[PDB]
Each structure stands twice: as structure tokens, then as C-alpha cells.
Amino acid sequence: HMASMKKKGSVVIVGRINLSGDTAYAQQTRGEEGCQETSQTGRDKNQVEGEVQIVSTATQTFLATSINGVLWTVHHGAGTRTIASPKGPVTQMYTNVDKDLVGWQAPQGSRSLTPCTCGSSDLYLVTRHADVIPVRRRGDSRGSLLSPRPISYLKGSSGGPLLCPAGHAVGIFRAAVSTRGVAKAVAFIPVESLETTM
Ligand SMILES: CC(C)(C)OC(=O)N[C@H]1CCCCC/C=C\[C@@H]2C[C@@]2(C(=O)NS(=O)(=O)C2CC2)NC(=O)[C@@H]2C[C@@H](OC(=O)n3cc4cccc(F)c4c3)CN2C1=O
Numbered sequence: 294h295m296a297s298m299k300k301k302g303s304v305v306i307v308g309r310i311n312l313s314g315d316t317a318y319a320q321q322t323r324g325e326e327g328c329q330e331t332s333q334t335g336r337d338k339n340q341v342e343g344e345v346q347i348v349s350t351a352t353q354t355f356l357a358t359s360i361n362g363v364l365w366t367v368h369h370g371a372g373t374r375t376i377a378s379p380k381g382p383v384t385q386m387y388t389n390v391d392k393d394l395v396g397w398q399a400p401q402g403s404r405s406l407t408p409c410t411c412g413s414s415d416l417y418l419v420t421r422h423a424d425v426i427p428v429r430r431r432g433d434s435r436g437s438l439l440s441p442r443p444i445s446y447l448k449g450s451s452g453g454p455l456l457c458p459a460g461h462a463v464g465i466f467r468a469a470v471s472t473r474g475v476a477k478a479v480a481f482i483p484v485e486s487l488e489t490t491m
């Protein structure tokens with residue numbers, strides 16, 4: 294009945310993929326109990342750093358990537374949810390189910406990637422375990438893994454970036470193309486589609 298209707302929680306930043314140095318590594322900044330509480334309140338006072346965040350809801354964990362001052366992720370992870378922030382829940386500024394794309398204003402302290410203008414097809418996918426996987430671009434929204442991986446390896450990395458050699462954002466990881474559970478290719482949201490959305 295109306296009085297007892299629940300609301301979905303916020304997406305919560307729970308860590309980040311550190312790409313600053315010469316070693317890439319995943320860092321957790323909030324544990325599960327704190328994530329649960331922050332999802333309910335929508336109030337997150339933790340400091341945010343870096344370009345790739347690890348994000349969670351009550352039921353899923355995935356990635357989100359800052360590009361041109363917007364924190365982007367996949368709709369199949371975030372739905373229409375708010376994101377937790379120091380001042381309470383923040384509403385999505387972009388929602389596009391047709392593109393499997395959402396975005397919120399980038400949190401204070403994040404750093405943004407620049408959209409790629411290189412026209413280059415040698416790419417790199419960053420996973421939630423901070424693996425940096427070479428990917429050859431094969432079309433507007435597809436690329437092949439140079440070394441195939443079981444899909445287990447890629448699960449939870451949607452919302453992460455594909456980058457060019459120079460570290461520009463080329464796209465947002467959306468889906469794995471798998472045969473018999475082995476991913477030989479990935480599908481991504483091209484950065485130009487984000488740029489049009491903006
Ligand atoms: C499209 C094609 C060629 C048929 O392929 C596939 O459908 N294959 C599957 C293989 C799944 C096995 C695991 C693969 C491992 C990792 C995958 C990256 C990943 C992920 O980590 N999600 S998550 O755990 O973080 C999760 C917590 C956030 N995404 C998925 O699972 C997505 C979700 C779902 O697809 C979608 O709802 N949309 C809506 C779209 C709108 C436009 C364009 C698109 F393409 C769209 C795809 C199926 N997905 C695949 O990948």
C-alpha cells in the first residue's frame with residue numbers, strides 16, 4: 294500500500310581504480326556495512342579521487358568513469374538511481390536506456406578523462422581489478438581482446454573505460470561478446486555518443 298512503499302537506494306562510490314602512478318590497482322574506500330548505510334541515506338562524506346570509481350548498489354557492483362566533468366556508468370547497473378554525495382542524493386543529469394548510459398555531475402575531487410580525438414584503433418580496457426587489457430577497435434562500438442578471457446574476468450567492470458594509447462577516453466564498457474563463456478570481444482558506448490548526450 295502507499296504508506297509502506299520503499300524507495301531504491303543510491304549508487305555509492307566504494308573505491309576507485311588507481312591509474313596515477315606506474316602501477317594500476319584497485320582501492321576500496323568503503324566497506325559493505327558503510328555502503329549499505331550510505332545507499333539508504335544518500336549522504337557520502339568520503340573523499341573522492343581519480344577517474345574511475347568502483348560503485349555499488351545494494352545488489353550490484355560495477356564501475357563509473359568521469360569524462361568532461363560527468364561521472365558516467367551503465368543503465369543496467371545504475372537504473373535511474375541517485376548517487377550518494379556529501380550533501381545528500383544527487384539526481385542523474387543524463388539517463389538514456391537506449392544507450393545503456395547514465396551520468397551524474399562528477400564528484401568534487403574526481404579527475405576527468407578527455408574524449409579521444411586520435412582516431413586510433415589500439416585501445417586498452419580497465420577492469421575493476423585494475424587489469425589493463427589491450428583491445429583492438431573493430432567498429433564503432435566493438436573491440437576484440439588480444440587475449441580472450443572467461444567472462445568471469447570481466448563481470449563487474451561495465452561502466453569502466455576504454456582508453457587510447459595517450460590515455461584519452463574512447464568509450465564506456467557495456468557488454469561482453471562471449472562464446473561458451475569466453476569473451477573474445479567487448480561492446481562499448483563510444484565517447485562521441487556521450488559527447489552528443491552532453
Ligand atoms: C549485447 C551482446 C552483444 C548481446 O552481448 C551481451 O549482451 N553480453 C552479455 C554477457 C553477460 C555475461 C557477463 C559478461 C561480463 C561482463 C560485462 C560488461 C558487463 C558487466 O560487467 N555488467 S556488470 O556485472 O557490471 C552489471 C552490474 C552492472 N555487461 C553485462 O553483463 C551486460 C548486461 C546485459 O546487457 C544489457 O543489459 N545491455 C542493454 C544495452 C543497450 C544498448 C547496447 C548494449 F550492448 C546493451 C546491453 C547483458 N550484458 C553482457 O555483457
Ligand SMILES: [Zn+2]
Binds near residue numbers: 408413457461
Ligand atoms: Zn586519444
